Design a protein around this ligand. Structure first.
Ligand SMILES: *[C@@H]1O[C@H](CO)[C@@H](O)[C@H](O)[C@H]1NC(C)=O
Lengths: 48, 42
């Protein structure tokens, strides 16, 4: 409890930085976005 | 004043040592001075 009480502002700043960092995780290098695009491509390829 | 109840059924019971665990103080804890449960007595 003492660490969380002393480092509350650092915890909030780090959480805000991590939550704002996920805006740019939508590129081709990301694995989950690649899986999303693979699912969409499979859906299109069946019709093709 | 303050009673202990179960997490899945509402039944107010007296606060005992079986029901409670000692923890480090937190500023969001209630500082009670009139009626004190027996596990917090001396
Ligand atoms: C209980 O006492 C602590 C110690 O000063 C204080 O920080 C806290 O605000 C108090 N809480 C209440 C509900 O009075």
């Amino acid at each position: 409890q003492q660490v969380l009480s002393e480092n509350q502002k650092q915890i909030d700043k780090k959480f805000n930085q991590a939550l704002n960092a996920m805006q740019t995780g939508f590129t081709t290098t990301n694995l989950a976005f690649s899986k999303v695009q693979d699912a969409v491509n499979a859906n299109a390829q069946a019709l093709a | 004043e303050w009673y202990y109840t179960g997490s899945s059924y509402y039944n107010p019971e007296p606060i005992s040592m079986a029901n409670t665990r000692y923890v480090s103080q937190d500023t969001k804890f209630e500082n009670l001075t009139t009626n004190i449960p027996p596990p917090l007595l001396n």
